[PDB]
Amino acid sequence: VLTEGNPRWEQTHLTYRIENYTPDLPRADVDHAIEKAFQLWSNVTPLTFTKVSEGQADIMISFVRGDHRDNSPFDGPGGNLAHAFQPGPGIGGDAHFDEDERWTNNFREYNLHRVAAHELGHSLGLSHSTDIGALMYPSYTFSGDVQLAQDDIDGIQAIYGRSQNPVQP
Ligand SMILES: COc1ccc(S(=O)(=O)N(Cc2cccnc2)[C@@H](C(=O)NO)C(C)C)cc1
Ligand SMILES: [Ca+2]
Ligand SMILES: [Zn+2]
Ligand SMILES: [Zn+2]
C-alpha cells in the first residue's frame, strides 16, 4: 500500500507451488534448480520458504506457450524469455517461463536455474541493477559461476536485515 503498484512482502515466510513441469526436463532436475535458488536467498536472509501442494501459494510458477490469456504473448525465440507480475495479491507474485525455447541444466543455449533466480529477484522486489556480477541483468547474457553478488546480498538484506544466525546444521 505504501508503494504505488509495488508492495513488498510484509511476511517473513513465503510459500510457492509449481503448476506443472515442462516436458523439456523432468521434475527432479527442475525441483533441484528451483530448490537450490530458494536456498541461496534464505542462506543470507532469515526468510523461510515452503512448497505447498494445495491452496494458493504466494508465488505461483507455471510454463506457458504462445498467447496464454495475457497482454504480453511471446513472439517466437525473439522478445523476452520470461516475465512475472509485481509482488501483490491476485495474479501478483505469479511468474511464467517461456516454454517455446528448450531449457537445459548446463551452460547450453539457456540456463533454467539462472532465469528462476532472476524471476525470484522480481518477486522479492529487487529491481534491475548495473552491476556486472548482479544476476538481475536486464537482457540475457553468459555469466561465470552462479553466485549472489554483494550488491544483491546487501539489497535483500537491507530491505529485511542480515541473517544474524549463520548456523549450518
Ligand atoms: C537471468 O535473468 C534474466 C531473466 C529474464 C530475461 S528476459 O529477456 O526475459 N527480459 C529482459 C529483456 C528482453 C528483451 C528486451 N528488453 C529486456 C525480461 C526480464 O527482465 N525478466 O526478468 C522482461 C522483458 C520481461 C533476461 C535475463
Ligand atoms: Ca523468446
Ligand atoms: Zn505468461
Ligand atoms: Zn528482469
What nine digits make up the cell of 163? 541473517
**Is the CB of 113 inside a 6 Å radius of any atom of ligand 1?**
no
Distance CA 128, CA 8 (A): 16
Q: Which atom of ligand 1 is nearest to the CA of 81?
A: 9
Q: Which atom of ligand 1 is nearest to the CA of 84?
A: 25
Q: Which CATH superfamily is domain 1-169 in?
A: Collagenase (Catalytic Domain) (3.40.390.10)
How is residue 62 annotated by DSSP?
E
**Is the CB of 78 inside a 6 Å radius of any atom of ligand 1?**
no
In whole angstroms, how far apart are CA 97 and each of 10, 113, 122, 160? 26, 12, 13, 27
CA-wise closest residue to 85 among 6, 1, 165: 6
What ranges do the domains of the chain cover? 1-169
Tell me which ligand sits closest to the C-alpha of residue 115.
Answer: 1
Residues 12 and 48: beta-carbon distance below 8 Å: yes
